[PDB]
Amino acid sequence: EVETFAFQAEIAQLMSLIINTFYSNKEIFLRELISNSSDALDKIRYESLTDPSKLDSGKELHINLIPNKQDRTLTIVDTGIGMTKADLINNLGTIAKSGTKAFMEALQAGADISMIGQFGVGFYSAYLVAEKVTVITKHNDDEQYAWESSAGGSFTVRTDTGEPMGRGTKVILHLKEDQTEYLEERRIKEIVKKHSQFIGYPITLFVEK
Numbered sequence: 001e002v003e004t005f006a007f008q009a010e011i012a013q014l015m016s017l018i019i020n021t022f023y024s025n026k027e028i029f030l031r032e033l034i035s036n037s038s039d040a041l042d043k044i045r046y047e048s049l050t051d052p053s054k055l056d057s058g059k060e061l062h063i064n065l066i067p068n069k070q071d072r073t074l075t076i077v078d079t080g081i082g083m084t085k086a087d088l089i090n091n092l093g094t095i096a097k098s099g100t101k102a103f104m105e106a107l108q109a110g111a112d113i114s115m116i117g118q119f120g121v122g123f124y125s126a127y128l129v130a131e132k133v134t135v136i137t138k139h140n141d142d143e144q145y146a147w148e149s150s151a152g153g154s155f156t157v158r159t160d161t162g163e164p165m166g167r168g169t170k171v172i173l174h175l176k177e178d179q180t181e182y183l184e185e186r187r188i189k190e191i192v193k194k195h196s197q198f199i200g201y202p203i204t205l206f207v208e209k
C-alpha cells in the first residue's frame, strides 16, 4: 500500500534547480548526507543519556558507505534516531519549506550550491548525482518505512517489508549514468577525507568483491 504526496512548492522548486543547473562540484552531496547522518546519531546519543533503553534497538553508533557497481547505487547507512511516519509526511517538509526558501534567496545574493547545508536542506544535494532516492528508516517509536522520490514534484511513503533495520536510516542513491565515479573506492575515500574527516562517528567503506 503506497501513498503519494506532493512536495511543498518551495522544495519542488529547489529540486528542479538542483537537477537542471550545470554545477560540476557534485561531490558535496556525500558531505551533506554524512552530516545528516551525524546529526541523527547525535540525537539518539543524547536521548540515550537519560534513557539507556533507547539503544535497545542497537548500541553501535556509526555510518556505513556501500557502493554497488552492479545496481549503480550508493547507499549511506546510519544507526541514528531514524524518522517516524509523521517525520516523512509532515515534519521534515514543514522545516524544509522555510530552509529551501532562504537558500534560494541566498543563491541570488552571491551564494553557490555548496553552502546548502547552512540552510538545513543539504539532503536535496543527493539529486546532483541521483535520479531517484530511496530512504528506508526506522524510529524507536514507529514501524519501518520506505520513502522515495524521483523528483518531478511528488514522493511516496509505504511501510517497508524488506530487511528490518533495528534503528536508523539508509539512503539509497540510484545514480545517474554519468555519475558512477562515486562508486569507486578511491573516489569515495578522497571525498570522505576531504569533507568529512572530523565527523565524530566511524565511517566505514564497504569494499565490493
Ligand SMILES: N#Cc1ccc(N2CCOCC2)cc1
Residues within 6 Å of the ligand: 006, 007, 008, 011, 083, 087, 088, 089, 090, 092, 093, 094, 096, 123, 135, 147, 155
Ligand atoms: N514536502 C516534503 C518532504 C521533503 C523531504 C522529505 N524527506 C527527505 C529526507 O528523507 C526523509 C523524507 C519528506 C517530505
